[PDB]
Ligand binder design. Structure first.
Ligand SMILES: O=C1CN(C(=O)COc2ccccc2)CCN1
Ligand SMILES: *[C@@H]1O[C@H](CO)[C@@H](O)[C@H](O)[C@H]1NC(C)=O
Length: 342
């Protein structure tokens, strides 16, 4: 069980002004720290956020959060469930800012909601330094879905924050799960992100911002465009036929030729964007499943599981015989990999 701590700086808030926070389980015999960002879409205007507040309020407020949560998958402390990092210090950061972890805007007389995702990450890091993070050797910033995109937007800022605070020995790395999307043509989204950035006062990594310039920061929410600008090591996990990608593409699964070609082209394009990503795990599956699920160990690419690939990545940051880190399926249709989830 991970225990809840509400932020001591109560000006760093969820959407409705309640304090943000984190769940923590310490492991005093370990110098490894895993900070995981939750996902759950976003909202981009007053009316859309009001609807989310009625029926997804835990994603907008801490008022009803439980005092504990169970760590599962990569957050589990059991070796059988988590062969990778079972002995690590574990942190789960709830997503209560509805801004893909990009915002830096407080509630005020002109803003009904606060969008503070980027500041929540910074304040969690600062408060953890007094609870053992000051002695860390590795800080892995991980996340799923909107949290996976959040890793790409925030990993370099965490590295810069720790350097400026006086902790240059902590190696900051990222793990982005299910947050690598394509701005492709639909079978039958970029505008919502553009509007969101203005509504949230959203921030993007500085090198990417300088490439795309004013008004075009939305480009930095797409992994294939932001990843080449990042300095921290980042491991990318992405299903080739991600269900959220298909949803935004208006695809809902007797498949005729037009849809067959569309699905095959999508897998080929995703595979192409990962060609120059040396640490990656991309199975040919139709799924919405994420790395905090208990059975995350089951899927394999070319005979190698994700916990193994992550271990090989750790070794590479000290190619390796029998320990691969670039694992992208080449077969062209959902479930052509026999180990895909059901
Ligand atoms: O499959 C899912 C989808 N979810 C997401 O957050 C979608 O991912 C993103 C990533 C970036 C921006 C918007 C959405 C959570 C619920 N289960
Ligand atoms: C609390 O956080 C806000 C936003 O980052 C910051 O302006 C303020 O200085 C912080 N307060 C303290 C006491 O650190």
């Amino acid at each position: 069980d991970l225990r809840l701590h509400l932020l001591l700086n109560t000006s760093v808030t969820c959407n409705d002004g309640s304090p943000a926070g984190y769940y923590l389980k310490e492991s005093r015999g370990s110098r490894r720290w895993l900070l995981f960002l939750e996902g759950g879409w976003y909202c981009f205007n007053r009316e859309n956020c009001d609807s989310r507040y009625d029926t997804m309020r835990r994603l907008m407020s801490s008022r009803d959060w439980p005092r504990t949560r169970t760590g599962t998958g990569i957050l589990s402390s059991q070796p059988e469930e988590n062969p990778y990092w079972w002995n690590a210090n574990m942190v789960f950061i709830p997503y209560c800012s509805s801004d893909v972890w990009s915002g830096a805007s407080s509630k005020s007389e002109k803003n009904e909601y606060a969008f503070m995702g980027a500041l929540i990450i910074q304040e969690v890091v600062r408060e953890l330094l007094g609870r053992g993070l000051s002695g860390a050797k590795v800080l892995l910033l991980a996340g799923s879905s909107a949290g996976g995109t959040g890793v790409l937007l925030n990993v370099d800022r965490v590295a810069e924050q720790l350097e400026k605070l006086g902790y240059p020995a902590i190696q900051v790395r990222g793990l982005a799960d299910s947050g690598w999307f394509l701005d492709n043509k639909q079978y039958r989204p970029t505008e919502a992100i553009r509007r969101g950035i203005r509504y949230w006062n959203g921030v993007v990594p500085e090198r990417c911002r300088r490439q795309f310039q004013e008004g075009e920061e939305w480009n930095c929410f797409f992994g294939y465009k932001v990843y080449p600008t990042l300095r921290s090591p980042v491991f990318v996990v992405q299903w080739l036929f991600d269900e959220a990608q298909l949803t935004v593409d208006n695809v809902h699964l007797p498949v005729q030729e037009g849809l067959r070609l569309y699905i095959q082209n999508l897998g080929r394009e995703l595979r192409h964007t990962l060609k120059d990503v040396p640490a990656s795990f991309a199975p040919a599956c139709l799924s919405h499943e994420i790395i905090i699920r208990s059975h995350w160990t089951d899927v394999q690419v070319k005979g190698t599981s994700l916990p193994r690939a992550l271990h090989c990545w750790d070794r590479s940051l000290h190619p390796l015989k029998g320990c691969p880190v670039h694992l992208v399926d080449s077969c062209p249709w959902p479930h052509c990999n026999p180990s895909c989830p059901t």
